[PDB]
Ligand binder design. Structure first.
Ligand code: HEC
Ligand code: HEC
Ligand code: HEC
Ligand code: HEC
Ligand code: HEC
Ligand code: HEC
Ligand code: HEC
Ligand code: HEC
Length: 436
């Protein structure tokens, strides 16, 4: 037994007061955790032409776009308390959130607009006393809401049909059963992070790399990622957003709904398309990814890929992997040719004032990178098309629903042979295209 139940009677009125207790004995864990991306929101990433500091802190996406000037809404999913703008003290140990991963009561909740602060009226003392090993639902406080359509609210206690590894009646894995954690470094590669292992966890430390009695299926694994055949669908239980058109935001037309009660229009955000039971898109992937970074020039007559997997048929490091792809339109500076990071949340933000010029001006004056590069909002904006790629790794289906020969070959359409660089279906056509 540990001392928790005896030492943490409180009263506690704030998160850091809780944390300041945890540190009388777990200063090491804070120090360790603070070295990681869960605390800094930064990752180094090797792009085709340059190494950058990406991570969430520096990323641009086609959903909410970017954290700067919006921090109080976004850092409800930071393992910290108080990150509300650019003055956040990343060296302050009393600001780590120790409860979000370790709460066992199921009541600990971070206020969705509170810059990481817990909701009002929690029994903090009680939460602190009951702290223990994370389960799926702790990771899921940030990982099941917003997007990746492969981790849903039902991954809290999913069935076999949803995920064979996490299946609470079967293998019942917690996330760290695969994402092994040492010194609060939670293992697992985000897309475009390496080194010479595309997947740090992948499928091959618990399965043989030739796991099939059918040898022809084993020969495919040099080219086709396990994830491709074994995750035939994501968003199995609940719709995910497939498109977000910001260009239409700001009108008082009716805020219409889906088959599934999801909004297809909202004044504050624009138009959406939702989909349930989604086939992935397939692409060559060798462990590296391209990314759009703040300040990059772009071209509005074309779709901009905000991220994209690298590799191709001639790339011996690349395999065909499955991806979720989200498309949209979003705001760009019509004079510089760059995407803008606008203020949507809070005072002057789009969501209260519905004025894109003001949201642009305020979001650009708050962005550290724009400032670093002397970039000023020009005063003119427009909307441009984008696509963004995320890896699909969860919801492995039972073996009976793996893609089989006829999903890809013969009348199968899973793979777009020519987009992948093949000369027709390789089974009809043993002449032109082979991986390596
Ligand atoms: C000393 C008075 C402690 C305070 C205050 C807190 N914790 Fe603790 N914790 C303490 C000990 C001696 C142990 C056992 C360490 C060992 O391995 O010998 C623990 C254990 C934990 C764990 C592991 C829980 C598990 O089920 O394995 C966690 C996750 C943990 N402690 C977290 C934690 C937090 C968040 C605290 C503030 C709320 C906290 N502890 C206070 C000693 C002490
Ligand atoms: C909210 C407070 C989170 C909780 C709770 C957990 N994670 Fe998380 N995770 C969060 C963010 C904002 C990010 C991106 C960090 C960045 O800037 O890069 C992540 C990332 C991951 C990753 C990807 C690797 C990485 O990006 O560095 C993994 C593999 C991951 N998270 C796993 C993970 C697990 C297993 C969790 C429970 C123990 C967990 N996370 C909690 C936000 C939050
Ligand atoms: C998720 C993003 C986490 C945050 C924030 C914190 N911890 Fe953690 N902790 C996390 C994991 C995935 C693990 C391993 C769990 C397992 O099942 O093996 C732990 C482990 C601990 C432990 C025991 C092991 C150790 O390193 O000593 C302790 C004592 C612990 N965690 C405490 C702790 C504290 C005090 C935190 C806030 C400052 C904290 N953890 C944050 C995941 C995450
Ligand atoms: C094995 C059976 C897994 C379980 C259980 C969970 N995850 Fe996972 N995850 C797994 C793999 C093979 C990968 C690819 C990365 C690798 O190094 O092999 C991932 C990846 C992630 C990521 C990164 C996704 C991305 O940004 O590209 C995250 C954020 C993530 N996983 C989170 C996560 C959570 C929250 C889980 C519990 C609900 C979880 N994973 C379980 C394998 C496995
Ligand atoms: C499609 C081209 C596949 C690739 C690539 C991989 N697998 Fe597969 N797998 C596929 C089928 C059609 C089936 C069902 C047929 C069967 O052998 O049952 C499977 C099955 C498995 C299983 C279950 C094996 C059994 O007990 O019968 C496992 C454990 C498994 N596959 C794992 C797996 C891994 C780890 C892969 C990458 C190394 C992999 N498969 C590739 C189709 C395809
Ligand atoms: C260990 C940490 C694992 C990792 C990482 C992955 N898999 Fe797994 N898998 C694991 C176990 C213990 C089991 C059950 C095996 C049994 O004896 O019943 C499985 C099961 C599968 C299956 C079979 C599902 C079924 O129909 O019963 C498949 C097809 C499978 N696993 C594939 C798979 C893939 C593609 C993974 C990477 C994303 C993966 N596994 C990771 C252990 C672990
Ligand atoms: C998609 C995810 C597939 C499934 C399911 C199956 N196959 Fe496949 N096939 C796929 C690719 C991407 C390739 C090219 C591999 C390469 O070397 O570049 C192939 C290739 C073949 C071939 C021609 C090569 C050969 O092995 O002689 C054959 C005859 C073939 N595939 C047959 C086959 C069968 C019988 C399958 C079911 C067990 C099967 N494939 C599944 C993609 C996919
Ligand atoms: C929890 C419910 C979240 C809230 C609220 C917000 N975000 Fe998030 N985001 C969350 C996680 C767990 C991750 C890591 C995903 C992984 O699989 O590795 C992220 C990541 C981002 C990124 C990086 C690129 C991407 O995956 O889209 C960006 C640019 C981003 N998030 C932006 C963002 C903004 C602007 C938010 C508030 C307005 C916001 N997020 C809230 C989880 C959660």
């Amino acid at each position: 037994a540990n001392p928790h139940k005896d030492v943490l009677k409180g009263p506690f009125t704030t998160g850091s007061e809780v944390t300041t207790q945890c540190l009388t004995c777990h200063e090491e864990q804070a120090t360790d955790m603070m070295k990681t991306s869960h605390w800094t929101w930064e990752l180094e990433q090797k792009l085709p032409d340059r190494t950058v500091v990406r991570g969430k802190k520096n990323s641009i996406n086609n959903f909410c776009v970017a954290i700067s000037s919006n921090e109080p809404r976004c850092t409800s999913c930071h393992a910290g308390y108080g990150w509300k703008d650019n003055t956040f003290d990343f060296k302050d140990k009393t600001k780590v959130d120790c409860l979000i991963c370790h709460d066992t009561t199921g009541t600990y909740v971070k206020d969705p607009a509170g810059a990481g602060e817990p909701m009002a009226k929690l029994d903090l003392a009680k939460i602190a006393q009951n702290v223990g090993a994370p389960v799926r639902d702790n990771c899921g406080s940030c990982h099941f809401y917003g997007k990746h359509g492969d981790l849903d609210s039902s991954m809290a206690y999913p069935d076999k049909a949803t995920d064979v590894h996490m299946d609470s009646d079967g293998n019942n894995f917690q996330c760290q059963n695969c994402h092994t954690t040492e010194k609060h470094q939670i293992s697992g590669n985000a897309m475009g992070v390496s080194p010479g292992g595309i997947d740090h966890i992948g499928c091959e430390n618990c399965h043989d790399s030739a796991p099939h009695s059918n040898k022809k299926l084993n020969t495919h694994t040099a080219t086709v990622a396990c994830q491709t055949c074994h995750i035939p669908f994501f968003a199995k239980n609940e719709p995910t957003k497939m498109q977000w058109d910001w260009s239409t935001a700001g009108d008082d037309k009716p805020e219409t709904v889906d088959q599934y009660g999801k909004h297809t229009y909202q004044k504050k955000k624009g138009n959406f398309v939702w989909e349930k039971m989604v086939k992935p898109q397939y692409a060559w992937y060798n462990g590296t990814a391209n990314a759009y970074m703040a300040g990059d020039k772009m071209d509005s007559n074309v779709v901009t890929k905000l991220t994209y997997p690298m590799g191709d048929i001639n790339d011996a490091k690349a395999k065909i992997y499955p991806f979720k792809v989200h498309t949209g339109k979003q705001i760009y500076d019509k004079k510089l040719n760059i995407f803008i990071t606008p203020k949507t949340y809070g005072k002057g933000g789009y969501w209260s004032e519905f004025d894109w010029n003001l949201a642009a001006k305020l979001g650009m004056e708050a962005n550290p990178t724009m400032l670093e590069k002397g970039i000023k909002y020009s005063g003119e904006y427009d909307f441009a098309a984008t696509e963004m790629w995320w890896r699909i790794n969860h919801m492995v289906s039972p073996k009976e629903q793996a893609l089989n020969c006829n999903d890809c070959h013969n009348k199968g359409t899973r793979l777009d042979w020519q987009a992948l660089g093949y000369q027709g279906d390789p089974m009809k056509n043993k002449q032109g295209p082979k991986h390596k």
